[PDB]
């Protein structure tokens, strides 16, 4: 069962700065990694699919990259609305699994 490591668990950044969340898979999973955003009291929301594919309705500020075992979710010019929990999820091998989560702090 594929383990997804998200470290650090909390990330602090200054308004407008560039931020990067990391997700590490216990074994090579191509680019079968997806990112979700969950604001306080909200349900998860798909941000990036297959490591770097854009989703319609998501600010162009968000981008992903990586392949194999290391993945990055990036936000260029962070802002208040980005404060939330960010999760990665893999679909390479059954069963699907989720990372532990990374909190964005401004």
């Amino acid at each position: 069962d594929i383990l997804l490591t998200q470290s650090p668990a909390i990330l602090s950044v200054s308004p407008g700065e560039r931020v990067s969340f990391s997700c590490r898979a216990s074994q090579s999973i191509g680019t079968d990694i997806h990112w979700y955003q969950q604001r306080t009291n909200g349900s998860p929301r798909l941000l990036i699919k297959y490591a770097s594919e854009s989703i319609s309705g998501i600010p162009s500020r968000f981008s992903g990259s990586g392949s194999g075992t290391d993945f990055t979710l990036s936000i260029n010019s962070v802002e208040s609305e980005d404060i939330a929990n960010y999760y990665c999820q893999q679909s390479n091998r059954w069963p699907f699994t989720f990372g532990s989560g990374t909190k964005l702090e401004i």
Partner: peptide
């Protein structure tokens, strides 16, 4: 057939 089997990749 493959979903439900740990380690299976033929799942999408």
């Amino acid at each position: 057939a493959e979903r439900g089997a740990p380690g299976a990749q033929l799942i999408t």
